[PDB]
Amino acid sequence: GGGGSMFHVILFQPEIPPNTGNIIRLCANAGCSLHLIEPLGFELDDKRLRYHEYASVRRYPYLQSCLEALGQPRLFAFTTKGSRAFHEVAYQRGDAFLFGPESRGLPEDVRNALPTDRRLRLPMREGCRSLNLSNTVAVTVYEAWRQLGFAMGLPET
Amino acid sequence: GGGGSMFHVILFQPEIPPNTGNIIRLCANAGCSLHLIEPLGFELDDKRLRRAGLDYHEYASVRRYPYLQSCLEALGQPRLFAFTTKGSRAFHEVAYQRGDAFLFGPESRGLPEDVRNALPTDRRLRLPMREGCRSLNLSNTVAVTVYEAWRQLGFAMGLPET
């Protein structure tokens, strides 16, 4: 209902309002909770992407405040610097997924607080541009959701 | 056998440029060609793509057509799947294969009824959703669709398959 959701999506200092808009819609369709680590590059009444599709959007001053509030969930970081392909992991309910901001990496110190096998990467072809952040989150969430059989409800608390 | 990209992504009358900006990056990363059925809701041509920074290898795979049928003929009539909320079959039940083409409707309207029904029922696919939700963003739908099909092919990166 408000944190008993399937996965937790954590955006570290996101910068571009439409991306976060599209991630809110994605988390709604997939039953995930969304968490934003300040500072943000936009305020949360802008540009409404297109009542309460968004009310399930928490913001926090620091990564650690978010993770305390969530109960220290199993955490994976999704970075181009990953040591391991995202699809090799056995995801499970309550896992948290941490993504960096659009125009920069996730800080070195955040990435290195995670075990090596939990710094994950999507298949990035050589010489290519980065993927859009929202598409990255969608692909990550839908792969983890697929491993759970696209389960819709139980529990919906 | 006449497929030199992994998949073919076809946008029917795309309206919102950032969605197509995002899908160009996804197709480049996954090794897919991208085809846009006119009219578009925005400007797109090789000069604009070059002003963005794409060189010949990258924007040669981004092409426009007048009609859906003109596009399919240019591709050799590949197996075609259409991705819609009115689909009958869940998108993850298909066994995809190299050279498959994926058709997506516009942001505002979804595919024309006559386009959707031109396809066999078992190739009208839907993505899973919470009950009573609005569709996913068009570029998220494409990303999610392509990466599931690509996962089935082991994420083969530019493998020299015929």
Author numbering:
A (entry chain C): 1 to 50, 56 to 162
B (entry chain A): 1 to 162
Give the article text.
To produce a protein knot without open polypeptide ends, we chose the highly conserved bacterial RNA methyltransferase as a model system, namely YibK from Pseudomonas aeruginosa (PaYibK).
Here, we produced a trefoil-knotted protein without open ends, a truly mathematical backbone knot in a protein, by post-translational modification by enzymatic ligation. By introducing a longer nine-residue linker to the backbone cyclization (PaYibK_lo), a much more efficient backbone cyclization was achieved to produce a higher amount of monomeric cyclized YibK (cYibK_lo hereafter designated as cYibK) than the covalent dimer (di-PaYibK_lo). We determined the crystal structures of cYibK to a resolution of 2.20 Å. The root mean square deviation (RMSD) between the backbone Cα atoms of the crystal structures of PaYibK and cYibK was <0.2 Å, confirming that the backbone cyclization did not perturb the 3D structure of PaYibK in the folded state. The K d for SAH was 8.80 ± 0.01 and 8.93 ± 0.03 μM for lYibK and cYibK, respectively, which corroborates our structural analyses showing no appreciable structural perturbation in PaYibK after the backbone cyclization. The slower intrinsic unfolding phase of cYibK (kuH2O = 6.5 × 10−7 sec−1) was about 7-fold slower than that of lYibK. In contrast, 7.2 M urea-denatured cYibK showed a significantly smaller R g value than lYibK under the same condition (27.71 ± 0.15 vs 39.26 ± 0.38 Å). As observed for many backbone cyclized proteins, we think that the increase in folding stability of cYibK could be attributed mainly to the reduced conformational entropy in the denatured state of cYibK.
